Amino acid sequence: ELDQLRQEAEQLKNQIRDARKACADATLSQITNNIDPVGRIQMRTRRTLRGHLAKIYAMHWGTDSRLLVSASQDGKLIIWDSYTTNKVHAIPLRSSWVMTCAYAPSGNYVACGGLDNICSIYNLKTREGNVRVSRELAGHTGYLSCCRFLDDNQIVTSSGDTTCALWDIETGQQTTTFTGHTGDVMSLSLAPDTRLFVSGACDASAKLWDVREGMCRQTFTGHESDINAICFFPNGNAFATGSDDATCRLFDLRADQELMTYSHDNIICGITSVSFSKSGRLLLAGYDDFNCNVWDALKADRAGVLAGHDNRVSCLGVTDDGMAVATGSWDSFLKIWN
Amino acid sequence: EEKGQREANKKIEKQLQKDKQVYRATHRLLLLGSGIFETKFQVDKVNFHMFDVGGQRDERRKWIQCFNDVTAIIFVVASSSNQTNRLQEALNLFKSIWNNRWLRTISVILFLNKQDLLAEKVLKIEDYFPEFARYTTPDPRVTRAKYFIRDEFLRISTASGDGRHYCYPHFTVDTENIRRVFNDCRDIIQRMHLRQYELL
């Protein structure tokens, strides 16, 4: 009685595979074969933020495109003003081992977490004048790899326990859980509408989740190893994934197929972070070879190289206005590029 | 307001100078073998923070990278271990840690524990590791077995050392355990500095 369900699964797989093969009109490289090549992108370092003692693991800008928070495993959360290079805030953390940090859209709250299996939310606008720990979200059975704010009262987190969670901050409870991944969820990217979000895990697959229903809409495969980074396209109809197989892959949602692959023979290191530009034609990706590559997302030809770090690049920082990029590294320095 | 920003920056920088001076005077150890468990101790006025990584799901290839810059990894192994070959599992874990590009400079303090268990056991180690029948010490049974395991670990370690890191094996009481961790960390720092001066 179990073989008929086995071949039920087989029929579903074959139907989906053939329906995907049917929507194979042409390759992205074909329709994009008559566009103007971007050319050599020559960016220079404009600011060098120093002050962190240990390697930096994550950074997030904030909707103002001026301030930015950075997390360093020396146990520090530093909020800098990128214009003047001054340190606006310095927050000591309970656990030294942090992996992610988030800036709230309102600028009033900051969030961090890591191997402590907890998401700490600190308040920045206090009549006391000192930053306090406003909340501590607990319930994950694995390390936190990424967290992102929806508003001042909701936050989405991804953990090493192969699960994602939506948290209400006031009550401190877990409203919705997202399961289905078979490996560590390493990254998550919120869509501009805040209704959907994609997540990449160590099982070499990405998943699209709807926030208001708690169910996986689509699954995307094609990478050969773990997915470390994932970023949404500005319009929200596609995304990009960086993996340990030394390639980046652009997937589409309405097509349900992989659209493009960015790779080179002389690149044999993994991708640690990805981010699009305001227009979305430049795909910036940090690598373990201490450099960052700027790909032409439409032509797949490497257009630029940012080489100013002496250690592993860990995070990328395109702003909301698209004026500058921020790169953090294991050398304990942050760099602003224009 | 720019003057206020400068004043806030000056205050934050004084605090950060204090924090930097306090951060360099501490040594972080990774114990291997609610998300993390800390243990702070002090030997000869030198402070040590050891971290036991529990509450994880036995897939280490991602969260291990967080310890790229610790002073040492304390690797605890049971000399004695439906009985599975756990010694080979420990050997494979040690080999994977020794050859990880993000840990190629970290020295490992090996602790061979449960020697009384192995002692009462010797009178089952040869069904695995068929080379035990020819190995010779460099009762005699427990010495043979423990030194054979130590030599297996050292054989794994001395194949890719590159001179940048070493292994410090001990047979195992917290007194001499802590004293040994202290002495091995001292030796690790000394060897790093000596290699930097083209002396080792």
Epitope: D203, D245 | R60, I97, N100
Partner: nanobody, 128 residues
Framework: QVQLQESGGGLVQPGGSLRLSCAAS????????MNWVRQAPGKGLEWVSD????????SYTGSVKGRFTISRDNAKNTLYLQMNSLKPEDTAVYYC?????????????????????RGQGTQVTVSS
Amino acid sequence: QVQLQESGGGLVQPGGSLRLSCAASGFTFSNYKMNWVRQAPGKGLEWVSDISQSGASISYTGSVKGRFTISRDNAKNTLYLQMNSLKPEDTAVYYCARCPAPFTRDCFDVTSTTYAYRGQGTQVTVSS
């Protein structure tokens, strides 16, 4: 999708011979280090053997040294385990595992009980 299909397992009297074949798909077979793992009744996953990218470096577990032979055919993207002089202690499910990342000497988590790059495995039973 990454797929590893094992085949060639069955029943065999003690002291017989078998040849397990693992067919890989969905990745560049040559850039990865391959492993054979096994799980016996009422036991955990135990690493058996491993072979490197080129096929020069080979490693076995002491329990099978002199009996098992690992082979890699990169033209056909196939792994082979030739077992000779099988004992009743080899009855188990054998899995064909791939290291997580390419171009690396370290192989993490191939026996994690939920590894993603491991196949379904084949049964082997040595008895009368």
